[PDB]
């Protein structure tokens, strides 16, 4: 990461422990079950956040004890109060980076059957995430409501007309 | 990834500092994350490597064999996937620690938000018609069909939120 990286990312770990807590392996997959597709470039600054989080007292590490002993992390009230002050911010614009829409701006430059591949590729990416979604969705938020379904919801509509588009595009192509 | 995105502009014809720009906020500013302001250095840059020439013609850039020959093997490599952040999605994502009030008026100032995108995308496209190519529309179009596919979601999650109420 760098000096540019969003303050942001500290409110996706406090947010992921505001309903428990969780070991770093179980921050680490929701990560890149969910977060991926919609708050992802934060992967690898995981566990500096976390060590940052818990210098400032907003997080806390702990080694629960019962069976074998598992540390976790949990939340402080200072977390809790940074969190729900990020809930109360103005919503910022969505950020993207597409390589491929980038590589279909400069297409001229490429030949059909370099840009068919690549259209091929990225309409079976978009299939496969659609797949993954929905069941990581089930294991990651048992107990799930009609808010939190519209983040799923959202981004398999989008993918989804993404992946409809792209099949036209080739069509025409071929 | 700067470099190659200018490069790339510069492949067809030499262009201003404001032509660049142009392009970044007309076009870019939906599939790329560096603003022109950000990765206006790299063309003081590229010029001291011998990637493109500078001269007072206003000032215009014009691509080098070298700054060709970068271009090109950029586009050899491996398409990186997809990096997308959405504050909103994560406001939904943690939905359950706000209250209706808000999260209705997320929604509907998404629902505005990305109907004014597409609005953008279809003025432009008016203005861009004649020229744009295949491959320039495909970016166009999977943006119009995904913030299309993203309006009609959200207004059918605000119905629904407003008859639970």
Redesign the interface.
């Known amino acids: 990461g760098s000096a540019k990286d ?1 303050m ?1 990312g500290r ?2 770990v406090l ?1 992921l422990l ?1 309903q428990k807590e969780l070991s770093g392996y179980d921050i680490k997959i929701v990560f890149e079950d ?1 977060f991926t ?5 934060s992967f690898g600054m995981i566990y500096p956040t976390l060590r940052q989080l818990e210098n400032e007292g907003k997080i806390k590490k702990e080694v629960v004890m019962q069976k074998p002993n598992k540390k976790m992390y949990f939340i402080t009230d200072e977390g809790r109060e940074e ?2 002050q990020y ?1 109360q911010t103005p ?20 030949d059909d059957v370099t ?1 068919k591949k ?1 259209i091929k ?2 309409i079976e ?1 978009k299939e496969a995430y659609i797949a993954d979604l929905r069941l990581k969705y089930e294991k990651w938020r048992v107990g799930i ?4 379904e ?2 799923l ?3 398999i ?2 993918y ?3 992946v ?3 099949k036209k ?1 080739l069509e ?2 071929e």
Not at 93 to 106: A, G, I
């Open positions: 969003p942001k409110d996706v947010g505001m969910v597709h919609f708050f992802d470039g969190f729900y809930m919503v910022e614009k969505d950020v993207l980076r597409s390589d491929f829409l980038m590589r279909m701006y400069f297409g001229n430059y490429s840009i690549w590729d990225e990416r409501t009609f808010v939190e519209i983040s919801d959202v981004g509509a989008s989804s007309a993404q409809e588009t792209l595009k025409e192509l």
